[PDB]
Design a protein around this ligand. Structure first.
Ligand SMILES: CC(=O)SCCNC(=O)CCNC(=O)[C@H](O)C(C)(C)COP(=O)(O)OP(=O)(O)OC[C@H]1O[C@@H](n2cnc3c(N)ncnc32)[C@H](O)[C@@H]1OP(=O)(O)O
Ligand SMILES: CC(=O)SCCNC(=O)CCNC(=O)[C@H](O)C(C)(C)COP(=O)(O)OP(=O)(O)OC[C@H]1O[C@@H](n2cnc3c(N)ncnc32)[C@H](O)[C@@H]1OP(=O)(O)O
Lengths: 161, 161
């Protein structure tokens, strides 16, 4: 029922959205095929907006009032269905741990890290399924001990102190 | 009301918990002061167990049935109150994104990354408050556009198709 509409980038009113027009132009200056800018609309609410191309997510945002409702999951699946082998790459700053949690829940893992030219740090997250996930052995050892060890300690303050 | 008890490491029954005894011994083989192993008990349930020393978290686990109840937050605060300047360091595998979300919510950030000798990757997370958090400018540009742009599209299937 949700409406999926693409933004005609050359018809974006530059007098109203100057910075957005510049950001989109700079993205397309290094590209043969132009980037896509897609909005996901319910009634009179833009539930989410996503800048993307087949196989790569540039940026996406769900406005705060629409979060934790599956909108982000819907946009990423729409991106995969328009992607070769449904494989997608993205970039996330290491401080954006909430976004890391979102992508991780969607089957993505950190497979590259680097420092950009201006000094910023970034992770690449993909769903290529090469990275192995590793659970340390001490987690099981501690869990079994915590559940199984006998404890005979009684102390509550009631009639005595 | 929760009981906080330290495990006497030399009295751990080696016949019952051989691997745990070995893991604790290997941790203490490179240490002057021995590690601490603390359990957090409610009634007959060990809500959480934590291997730690002042200023450094080695490992902690809340059993699945006790999670998302603040137990993990309670243990980390207990660790800070027994830490110089309440500063703590920890190590998290990059695939353990759920743990990254937990520590991030407690005021921690990734401040170091490395590859260990056996090939494993790790982040160091601290609450030292040196790392700056960075929100990209395009998040605001996309949010303002999504909320403000006029949209005159009407399409619902009712009396017409
Ligand atoms: C686009 C890039 O490459 S990086 C920049 C990412 N965008 C941003 O950071 C902008 C600010 N944040 C947002 O707009 C949104 O929070 C997004 C885009 C990250 C996710 O949008 P949402 O619609 O809220 O995600 P969605 O509702 O589909 O949640 C799916 C699962 O992802 C996980 N998840 C989502 N958000 C979070 C979070 N903040 N922390 C931890 N896990 C999360 C949860 O497991 C969630 O399932 P649940 O709600 O049942 O617990
Ligand atoms: C110890 C180290 O250095 S690394 C290894 C960490 N331990 C493990 O991975 C073992 C398996 N996991 C666990 O035992 C637990 O999930 C822990 C220890 C990570 C956290 O224990 P919990 O008691 O569940 O954490 P707690 O209830 O205090 O939650 C505090 C906040 O942290 C965040 N948080 C906690 N768990 C998660 C998660 N799985 N994903 C994203 N965010 C989380 C939430 O914001 C939560 O607040 P909320 O419940 O209101 O949403």
């Amino acid at each position: 029922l949700m409406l999926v509409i693409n933004v005609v980038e050359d018809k974006i009113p530059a007098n109203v959205y100057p910075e957005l027009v510049e950001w989109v132009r700079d993205l397309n200056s290094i590209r043969e095929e132009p980037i896509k800018l897609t909005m996901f609309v319910e009634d009179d609410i833009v539930r989410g907006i996503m800048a993307w191309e087949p196989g790569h997510l540039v940026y996406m945002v769900v406005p705060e009032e629409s979060r934790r409702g599956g909108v982000g999951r819907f946009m990423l699946k729409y991106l995969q269905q328009n992607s070769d082998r449904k494989h997608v790459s993205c970039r996330v700053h290491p401080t954006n741990i909430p976004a890391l949690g979102f992508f991780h829940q969607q089957g993505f893992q950190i497979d590259r890290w680097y420092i950009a030219a201006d000094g910023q740090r970034y992770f690449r997250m993909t769903n290529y399924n090469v990275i192995s996930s590793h659970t340390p052995p001490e987690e099981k050892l501690l869990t079994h001990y915590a559940e199984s060890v006998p404890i005979f300690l009684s102390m509550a303050e009631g009639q005595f102190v």
